[PDB]
Amino acid sequence: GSHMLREKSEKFAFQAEVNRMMKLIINSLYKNKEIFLRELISNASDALDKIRLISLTDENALAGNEELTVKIKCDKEKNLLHVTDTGVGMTREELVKNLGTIGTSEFLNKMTEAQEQSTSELIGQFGVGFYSAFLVADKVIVTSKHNNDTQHIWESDSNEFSVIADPRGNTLGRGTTITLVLKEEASDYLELDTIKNLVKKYSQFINFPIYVWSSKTVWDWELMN
Numbered sequence: 001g002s003h004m005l006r007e008k009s010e011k012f013a014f015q016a017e018v019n020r021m022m023k024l025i026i027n028s029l030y031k032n033k034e035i036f037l038r039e040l041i042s043n044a045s046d047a048l049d050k051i052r053l054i055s056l057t058d059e060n061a062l063a064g065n066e067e068l069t070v071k072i073k074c075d076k077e078k079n080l081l082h083v084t085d086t087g088v089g090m091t092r093e094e095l096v097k098n099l100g101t102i103g104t105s106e107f108l109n110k111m112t113e114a115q116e117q118s119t120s121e122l123i124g125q126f127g128v129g130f131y132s133a134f135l136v137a138d139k140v141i142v143t144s145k146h147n148n149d150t151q152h153i154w155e156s157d158s159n160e161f162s163v164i165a166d167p168r169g170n171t172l173g174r175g176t177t178i179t180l181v182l183k184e185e186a187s188d189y190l191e192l193d194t195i196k197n198l199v200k201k202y203s204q205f206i207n208f209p210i211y212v213w214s215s216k217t218v219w220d221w222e223l224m225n
């Protein structure tokens, strides 16, 4: 089973439009970097609505994980921020397509014109806030498990991306973990007080419960909304 690594069939290039998109997003929100967390939580919320809808007509929808939540972990020691939801997840095919490709032109011109203003609303409306994670992270990693596939891992430094079967197996049960390798100057997002203030402000209108792994010295999940 060496055919895959010897042929590097796990490596992909982003679609031109996506590269241009990442730049627009990264350039416009340069002064409002914290918005990334809001967009991740928002993407989590959508993923949770989807699985909830599927659970209405599919009796075995929540088999892999009976809960519907969003959990945030700060790993200061490893310089990582994790955002995990137990939503619908993404198959290997969807990781490639949904994250690596994409009113695209209108948004293309609307964004440029919105910079030559605030773009936070547009990005949020068109649902492409995922990329805003690159404002605070050098590498973005997406671990996901969809009912129709095995767990997979997508990773990118924005110059390319790759998808690989997760050698750890099905640890998520169902859902997605957005792991951010924080830039040196973005260490503040590893601070519990900082994350809690952002998560609380950004989860205020999310219908699913959002938790942050915090201390009180004992650790446990803390409800934020």
Ligand SMILES: Nc1ncnc2c1ncn2[C@@H]1O[C@H](C(=O)NCCO)[C@@H](O)[C@H]1O
Residues within 6 Å of the ligand: 043, 044, 047, 085, 087, 088, 089, 090, 098, 099, 101, 102, 127, 128, 129, 130, 131, 175, 176
């Ligand atoms: N947490 C998440 N769970 C499931 N799907 C997710 C997700 N975060 C992002 N996605 C998928 O990836 C897409 C995405 O954010 N692409 C970035 C902008 O085109 C979303 O439209 C959604 O289909």
